[PDB]
């Protein structure tokens, strides 16, 4: 598909060349934001795991769980 690209360091999405906004930080780090939604989160100090649109979330569930213990007078 696309062979020349950047990668959004927030929302994960491929950024086309001739697109996006790159924040140059004072410590010389580069952060790549696909669009204005992406960069607002960074400025506001959102962790991407903090359910932003749900960026670097997506983590596995498990199943249900037993009725055991958690204070119920057994030993």
């Amino acid at each position: 598909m696309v062979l020349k690209t950047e990668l959004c360091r927030f929302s994960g999405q491929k950024i086309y060349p001739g697109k996006g906004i790159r924040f140059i930080r004072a410590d010389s780090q580069v952060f790549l934001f696909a669009n204005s939604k992406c960069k607002r989160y960074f400025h506001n100090r959102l962790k991407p795991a903090k359910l932003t649109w749900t960026a670097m979330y997506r983590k596995q569930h498990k199943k249900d769980i037993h009725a055991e213990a958690v204070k119920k007078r057994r030993r």
Binding site: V2, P17, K19
Partner: protein, 389 residues
């Protein structure tokens, strides 16, 4: 001076001075280059409807400034440019009052062409089977009339012109069904040959590829988007008057001087803005094509992957392109769903702007904001749907 010797250049051009409503919905170039070139394949203009705008990335090449070569983003206007039905060969003889038509020839078989044309051009939106155009002549009477014109043309050396009309009925997405009759000049060789060809040329369409060559600098002429009625500030580009508060903000202060008892034409005040005829010159025609049966699409992998030139979800307020397309450099005058005409550059010089072609890499036909690039990526989003999407 008289007062304050700190003076500014004048706001708003005097060559773009009457900012007022265009006479017709389609711009009409008032002169054309002179007949000096190839035979009546060379129409000097073609018409389309501005579809919207897209973007293309092209890999430059120059050396003067610091950075050069490598990819560059570019704006490009996409225009749907259907093949156009040339109706007639019209004989305009030059006079010392400027050109005068002697007669106009109309095709041998019009019965749908003039009937879609007719809610301006004439009037009434196809009701009871009416709005009348002349029906084709007696068989050998009408043919004789055409050849009588050939004699007149070939004795004074007529500047050959063509009446054509835009068949917008080949497009669907644009809600207008109404053909626009227009005059496009024919350029080429000797009078006898060009006229003879021109008779045969109304018995068949003319495509995009046959009027413009790729790379060419083409002046694009249209009528700007209508904005409505607008202030001084956005009509002439004057300053706001500056204060904390002030009984006029978006205003000019003084519109003359005491002794000439009359307001100048050059002073800036409000009025209509937009819907103005304008010419915007020297636009590189990057690509000409069409959906399926002209162009391929793209060449796969590095070149680019196949991407239809419409953005997914269609152009806002236009329709969806699924036909002819023409990539003309940068911005283009007009809104969307208005006639734009392309007419070859009068300054045939070129010189060095582009010169060399500059192979199409990316189209930016944007389907993004979290997804996109046709088919597979759209499928990925649809996977997170399915039974309510």
């Amino acid at each position: 001076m008289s007062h304050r010797k700190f003076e500014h250049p004048r706001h708003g051009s005097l060559g773009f001075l009457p900012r007022k409503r265009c006479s017709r919905h389609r711009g009409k170039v008032k002169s054309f280059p002179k007949d000096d070139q190839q035979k009546p394949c060379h129409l000097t203009a073609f018409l389309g409807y501005k579809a919207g705008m897209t973007h293309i990335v092209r890999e430059v090449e120059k050396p003067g400034s610091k950075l050069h070569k490598k990819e560059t983003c570019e704006a490009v206007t996409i225009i749907e440019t259907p093949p156009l039905v040339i109706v007639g060969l019209v004989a305009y003889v030059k006079t010392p009052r400027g050109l005068r038509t002697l007669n106009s020839v109309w095709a041998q078989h019009l019965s749908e062409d003039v009937r879609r044309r007719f809610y301006k051009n004439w009037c009434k939106s196809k009701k009871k089977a009416f709005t009348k155009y002349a029906l084709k002549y007696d068989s050998d009477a009408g043919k004789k009339e055409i050849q009588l014109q050939l004699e007149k043309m070939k004795k004074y050396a007529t500047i050959v012109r063509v009446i054509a009309h835009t068949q917008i009925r080949k497009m669907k997405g644009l809600k207008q069904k109404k053909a626009h009759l227009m005059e496009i000049q024919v350029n080429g060789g000797t009078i006898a040959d060009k006229v003879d060809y021109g008779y045969k040329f109304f018995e068949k369409e003319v495509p995009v590829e046959a009027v413009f060559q790729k790379d060419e600098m083409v002046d694009i002429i249209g009528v700007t988007k209508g904005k409505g009625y607008e202030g001084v500030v956005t009509r002439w580009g004057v300053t706001r008057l500056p204060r904390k508060t002030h009984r006029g903000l978006r205003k000019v202060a003084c519109i003359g001087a005491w002794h000439p008892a009359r307001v100048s034409y050059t002073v800036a005040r409000a009025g209509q803005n937009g819907y103005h005829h304008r010419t915007e010159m020297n636009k590189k025609i990057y690509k000409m094509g069409k959906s399926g049966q002209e162009s391929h699409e793209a060449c796969t992998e590095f070149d680019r992957t196949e991407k239809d030139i419409t953005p997914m979800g269609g152009f806002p307020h236009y329709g969806v392109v699924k036909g002819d397309y023409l990539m003309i450099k940068g911005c283009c005058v007009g809104p969307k769903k208005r006639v734009v005409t392309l007419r070859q550059s009068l300054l045939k010089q070129t010189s060095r702007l582009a010169l060399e072609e500059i192979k199409l890499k990316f189209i930016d036909t944007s389907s993004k904001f979290g997804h996109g690039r046709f088919q597979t990526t759209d499928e990925k989003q649809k996977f997170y749907g399915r039974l309510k999407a």
